[PDB]
Symmetry: C3
Subunit: 46 residues, 3 copies
């Protein structure tokens, strides 16, 4: 019924969010490396 439906909805929503969070964490960690590299380079230059 209504409750079983909402629980199913919540299940699928949480699954989606888990995947999107995993993507963001990984990209954030990856881009952060290159950004720090570029800043460090410029600072050693000036």
């Amino acid at each position: 019924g209504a409750l079983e439906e909402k629980v199913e909805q919540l299940g699928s929503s949480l699954d989606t969010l888990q995947t999107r969070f995993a993507r963001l964490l990984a990209e954030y960690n990856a881009t952060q490396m290159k950004m720090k590299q570029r800043l460090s380079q410029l600072e050693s230059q000036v």
Copy 2:
């Protein structure tokens, strides 16, 4: 009833986190662009 309320609280906590995650994602993507541009302009200036 008890279960209905646990499911309510679960839905409301999940909604809050989805909204928070959506904002962080958009901000991350936005600041990545700005910062990369600011870096490019410094790299050329040096």
Copy 3:
């Protein structure tokens, strides 16, 4: 029953994600401040 048990599993998963997200958001904000400052120092210096 199976419904109450799915609800309890979802609650545990969400709580874990909430904590992981709080960790990510906090470090994102902190590193953003620092990156901005570094950029602005570099721009000041040319």
